[model samples]
Target: HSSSVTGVAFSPDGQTIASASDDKTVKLWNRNGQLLQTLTGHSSSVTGVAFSPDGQTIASASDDKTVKLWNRNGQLLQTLTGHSSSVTGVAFSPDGQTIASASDDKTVKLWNRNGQLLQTLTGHSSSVTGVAFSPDGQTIASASDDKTVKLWNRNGQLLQTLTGHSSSVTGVAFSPDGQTIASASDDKTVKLWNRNGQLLQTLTGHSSSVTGVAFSPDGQTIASASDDKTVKLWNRNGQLLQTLTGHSSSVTGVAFSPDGQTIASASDDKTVKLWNRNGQLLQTLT
Candidate 1:
């Protein structure tokens, strides 16, 4: 896409990157800055993209109110279209057997691997923006414009509603070990918590909306993408480790590779910036 990049994800093997953009397309690229494929189907802007745990397929969510599954070769596998409004996020279960999506319909829908609807978790009063599964694959966490993060079991039973941020939540991710959770918000704060919903600490550094938040594979490092045009790296205690100033526009999302050596950030500047954990720019793919 030639427009703003909204989301990015690395393949499970850490060799491939998928970027979603406002131009209604998703692109696949190599770690070394080579374009591999351009995925097209959605009639509206693509908002998010994720790789199946197996690395064989990719799921993309779009403002067209649908989610599409594609093979690694750019083949469309299935179209998931249950949401009545725009879909904002899509992610696979850790086991790769289920897919969860968040939508402006104010609900989170879970789909089986075959694209059949499994469950719809409804509670948020506003548009749900993001969804993620625990590493164990038994629990799902959803972030919403309602300014809350809700926890649900695989059977659609609501378990918890995490509230601390005074503004809409943008992203939510569970630590690799499933012991901690990190959430990003429009309030420019990243809050950490235990799995039980106890607030740990609020990480404050970003000068603008915190658009994206993620934990590294080791669960010791946290990265926050901000509208301030920078990415902030922090230790688990809210101590700033580094402030990555590698983007000229709003930072949309950030993720550490499975190998734990590279950090990739997508930006509204229409590029995906790659860097090391030490915050050194390695490459920029557009």
Candidate 2:
């Protein structure tokens, strides 16, 4: 990685980890922190990366306003473009049949597995910053600079708008059980919500904007990354569990291995650090 790492993800089986960075490339790594492949093509910083449900494909979003699909081996499969502004985030549906990209264009563009545009979900009043699919594949949640999170059906029907955040909602993730959603915001909080659009709990601790949030495989813990230079872990009830701090600058992303034994965080310090559940530092993937 040459610049700040923007996103981090673990493959379905927890054997592989992928990172997107301001360096304009996405790197694949094994659980041991060794490099697997370096995917390069985007003209600007790569903002997000997601592995397919089957663990055989990868999707990367970029500031170039395009999303690139690649095989697990790092070979480019397709270049998906429709958004008119910087593409900030990308995600694959639970079944791997649909791809969603959030953009500064203030919309979430949905595409088929073959890279064909399916629907342009437009309703947000400002830039859409992040997106995620529910575990059941029936819904999509989009976070926006409009300070709200919108939930929609997989086919693009707007279901509800979750509003409570005092600032831009930049990150969204669903619990594995498909019932709850976690939205992180620039307001320095994480708001939990149910699929019915009800607010569950508000998580507070970070001293700055939170950029990324991920649920543990067991769905009992939530790991969030913030500009405060730390990764914070919270249990199911939204109680702060621990604050793992070491990064010298903003921590932009955080993710848990599928088995929930290791937590990985990416930072503007230009490195990715892995830590055990007990907060013990493991390895630094520079």
lDDT of every predicted structure (CA atoms): 0.93, 0.93
The parts of candidate 2 lying over 4 Å away from their true place are: none
Displacement of the residue 63 alpha carbon in candidate 2, Å: 0.8
lDDT of 2 by residue, 190-211 (tens): 9999989999999999999999
Clashing pairs for predicted structure model 2, backbone only: none
165 Cα displacement, candidate 1 (Å): 0.5
Residue-pair clashes, model 1: 0
lDDT of 1 at 217: 89
lDDT of 1 by residue, 86-184 (tens): 999999999898999999999999998788999999999999999999999999999999999999998999999999999999999999999988999
Residue 229, candidate 2: Cα error in Å is 0.6
